[PDB]
Amino acid sequence: GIDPFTMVALSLKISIGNVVKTMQFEPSTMVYDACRMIRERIPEALAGPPNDFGLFLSDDDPKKGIWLEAGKALDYYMLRNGDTMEYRKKQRPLKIRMLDGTVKTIMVDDSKTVTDMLMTICARIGITNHDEYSLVRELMEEKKDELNWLDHGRTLREQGVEEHETLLLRRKFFYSDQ
Numbered sequence: 001g002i003d004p005f006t007m008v009a010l011s012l013k014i015s016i017g018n019v020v021k022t023m024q025f026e027p028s029t030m031v032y033d034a035c036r037m038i039r040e041r042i043p044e045a046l047a048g049p050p051n052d053f054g055l056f057l058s059d060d061d062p063k064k065g066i067w068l069e070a071g072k073a074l075d076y077y078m079l080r081n082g083d084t085m086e087y088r089k090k091q092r093p094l095k096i097r098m099l100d101g102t103v104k105t106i107m108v109d110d111s112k113t114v115t116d117m118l119m120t121i122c123a124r125i126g127i128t129n130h131d132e133y134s135l136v137r138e139l140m141e142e143k144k145d146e147l148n149w150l151d152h153g154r155t156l157r158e159q160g161v162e163e164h165e166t167l168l169l170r171r172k173f174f175y176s177d178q
Contacts, residue, residue, distance in 0.1 A: 010074060011081040015058065016044050016088070025074055031055050032070035038087055045087050054090040054111055057083070062157050067111035095166040096121050103166070115152040121169065132173035139165040 009024040021042050025034055034055060039045045045053065055068035057077065067090070068074070079085065091107035094117075098104070106124050108117045114135055122130035135150035139162070148159065149170075 010079055010083070012074075012079065013084040014038060014042065014045075015084055015086045016042075016047075019044050020084075021045075021087075027075035028073040029075075030070060030073045031068045034068075034074065035070075035087075042087075048089070052089050052091060052107070052109075053087060054109075056086040056088050056111075058086045062160055065157060069111060092163045094121070094163075097166060097168045098125055099169065099171060110156055113153065113155055114150045118152065118169070129175060132171065132175050134170045134172035135167060136170050137161060137165060137167045 005024075005026075008027050010027065010029075011022065011024050014021045014023050021038075021044065023038055023042070025037070031054065035050065035053065039050050039053070047053075057066050057068055057079070059065050066077075068077070068085070074085075089107065090109040090111050092110050093105050094108050095103060095105050104124065106121055108120045115131075118133055118135055119130045122128075122133060127133075134152070137146075137148035137150060137159075139146065139148060141148070143160075148161075150159075
């Protein structure tokens with residue numbers, strides 16, 4: 001209705017891929033309230049299903065960059081009048097090779113850990129026992145130079161991962177078709 005919007009409405013630049021929109025949000029707002037309104041007035045926000053779109057706070061560095069979860073408010077972080085807040089797909093194109101060597105690209109939310117990722121990936125193929133698999137990221141890492149066997153505990157950005165290298169689904173536990 002006639003909600004009170006005094007000098008307490010953070011001025012945020014929402015970057016949606018190429019386009020940049022200017023939106024103001026309450027100090028609180030909270031991601032879930034933000035995503036409802038931005039989708040409302042900004043038609044460029046919903047290039048697909050709204051549930052697949054979330055708030056990424058773009059700093060500069062991959063580690064400093066974080067996903068804004070619905071379980072926290074905007075101003076709770078460092079956001080204020082002047083921050084750029086990327087409205088992007090929660091998920092990003094992951095290149096995954098399955099057991100037979102079959103590769104697919106599936107969109108998995110980057111705002112969540114690896115186990116939930118694998119659940120999402122194995123579910124695309126039709127695998128129920130996703131817990132018996134580990135993840136291994138073969139990258140172009142100049143630093144690490146690793147297969148990067150995902151422990152299923154660490155978040156992706158904290159590894160310094162990218163969104164373009166091929167990741168392999170590996171059988172971890174010896175269910176052995178038993």
